[PDB]
Structure 1
Amino acid sequence: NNRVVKLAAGSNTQTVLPFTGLNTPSGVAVDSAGTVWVTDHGNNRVVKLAAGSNTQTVLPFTGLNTPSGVAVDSAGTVWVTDHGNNRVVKLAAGSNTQTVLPFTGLNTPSGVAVDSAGTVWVTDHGNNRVVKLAAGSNTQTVLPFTGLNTPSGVAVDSAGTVWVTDHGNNRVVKLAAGSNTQTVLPFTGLNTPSGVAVDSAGTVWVTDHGNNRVVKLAAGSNTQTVLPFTGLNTPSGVAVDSAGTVWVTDH
């Protein structure tokens, strides 16, 4: 539906954000200030809406092709998976020069996530794996997930646990750092899930793209719920801030 919708925690009444001219928006990311970044996938661009503004800005990336995931940090740096060019690119706040990260061997990468250390994780969707780029050293490693099939979304929480939507297997998996135990989350009945978001409380939200719905596992619960969005079609991406406001790209 070429729009971005949000729901405040406990609300039944979504808001449509005043983005304009979106074409198949995919990734979304938010910071604590309420700023929203969206990969406008069909237009090969990344757009941004500052809180209280009604007019988006376009980040000065160049040469993107079918960009997918987007991530941001507290310094205001923005990373975008340039899915069509098998690369990840970033822009620092206030800068006109984009930087191609030293990942190697990516194929149709999907999601991107970062932590406060500057570590970057990418779902290397076409290679059925998640790759981590260590800050400073730029060492690449492959996380020991197993059995992934076209993974798409990725998120990392403050404890450093990696969540992935295992899109081709209709499931969501998580893996703590250093670990060789992956946990399948008790979501049920998913179809080509596409985005995942996690808050500090440990709640997890997933865009269940094939079922036109956003599902949630509240922290300490084993019962999934469906957020009361209205009119969603193939939601792609999801982001949450501290408080449980949820933004979704209604791709």
Structure 2
Amino acid sequence: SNTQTVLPWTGLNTPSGVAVDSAGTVYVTDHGNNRVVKLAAGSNTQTVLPFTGLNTPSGVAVDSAGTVYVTDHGNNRVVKLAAGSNTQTVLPWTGLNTPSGVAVDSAGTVYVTDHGNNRVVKLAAGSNTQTVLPFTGLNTPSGVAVDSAGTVYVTDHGNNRVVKLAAGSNTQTVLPWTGLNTPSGVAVDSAGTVYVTDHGNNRVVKLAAGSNTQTVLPFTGLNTPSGVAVDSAGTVYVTDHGNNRVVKLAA
């Protein structure tokens, strides 16, 4: 598709992050209202998830079980809420300063970019052992994604680059993403295409696996795109921060 759709949310303010589950439900960190909102596919009526005491949440992810993970930036913590529950769980991150993004893989491992500590950390499901991913040269990592192979993708906001790290590997690859400025969000689809939100150029770009040739996605009227998600159908969802809206673009 060539023309974007504005999702029927109400009362958003400076939305910071977006996730989408297998059922097409869309989840948004309504950063300016200190809450997390949820929208079923083909619904015009959001619901507010019963998190407690959030403060300018920066990012969101959802796993196969429908559990929702939120980087509660203002409180230096990451919380999760299982589907149907009213009790949030504070994850056992230690030494976590300012979480800027969160991703969860199919095995339930959680990945968090720590903006204030210039690093990316992960929590294995069940084990709850934090480890620091051996990225090198980072500078205020702003978002994170994980593909089905376990490759971790980080937007290295300070160095205008996207870097990836193969699972258990010691090889970090800079994506040959020409013209990138201040990347702020990342997502990866099942074909390994990478989607990045770019503040400097105020746009959303994508890069196919094994490609030097980006596409600028034809969104329109964006003011600071802040988060991005891609569903199994290839629909691209973007939080339009400066416009208090969430836009999407079918494949």
**TM-score scaled by structure 1?**
0.94
Identity of aligned residues (%): 96
Q: What are the Cα deviations for residues 13-43 of structure 1, in whole angstroms up to 9, with x where unaligned?
A: 1000001111100110011211100001111
Aligned to 2:196, what secondary structure does the other structure show?
strand
CA distance in 2, matches of 1:171, 1:109: 19
CA RMSD of aligned residues (A): 0.8
CA–CA distance in 2 between the matches of 1:115 and 1:67? 20
Q: Offset at 1:210?
A: 2.3
Report deviation, 1:189: 1.9
| Count of aligned pairs | 241
Give per-residue Cα distances to partners, 1:67-105, cap 9 Å, x unaligned: 011000111000000011110000000000000000011
Q: Say whether residues 1:198 and 2:188 are aligned partners.
A: yes
Distance 1:87 1:232 in 2: 29
Match of 1:242 in 2: 232
Runs of at least 5 residues in structure 2 that lack an aligned partner in the other structure: 242-251
More moved, 51-60 vs 219-228 = 219-228
Distance 1:77 1:174 in 2: 25
- In 1, distance between residues paired with 2:151 and 2:209? 15
Q: Which digits, 9 at most, give the CA deviation of each residue in 1:138-174, with x for residues without a partner?
A: 1110000001000011000111000000011111000
SS of residue paired to 2:86 = coil
Task: Kindly provide the CA deviation profile for residues 166-209 of structure 1, in whole angstroms up to 9, marking residues without a partner as x.
Answer: 01111100001111110000112222111000001110000012
Contact 1:211-1:234 within 8 A present in 2 as well = no
Find the partner of 2:162 among 157, 172, 175: 172
Q: For 1:55, what is the secondary structure of its paired residue?
A: coil
Q: CA deviation at 1:115?
A: 1.3
1:30–1:36 CA contact under 8 A, matched in 2 = yes
- Displacement after TM superposition at 1:221 (Å): 2.3
Give 1 or 2: higher strand fraction. 2
1:98-143 CA distances to partner (integer Å, 9 max, x unpaired)? 0000001111111001112211110011100000111112111000
| Shift, 1:243, TM fit | 2.5
Whole-angstrom CA distance in 2 between matches of 1:211 and 1:151: 18
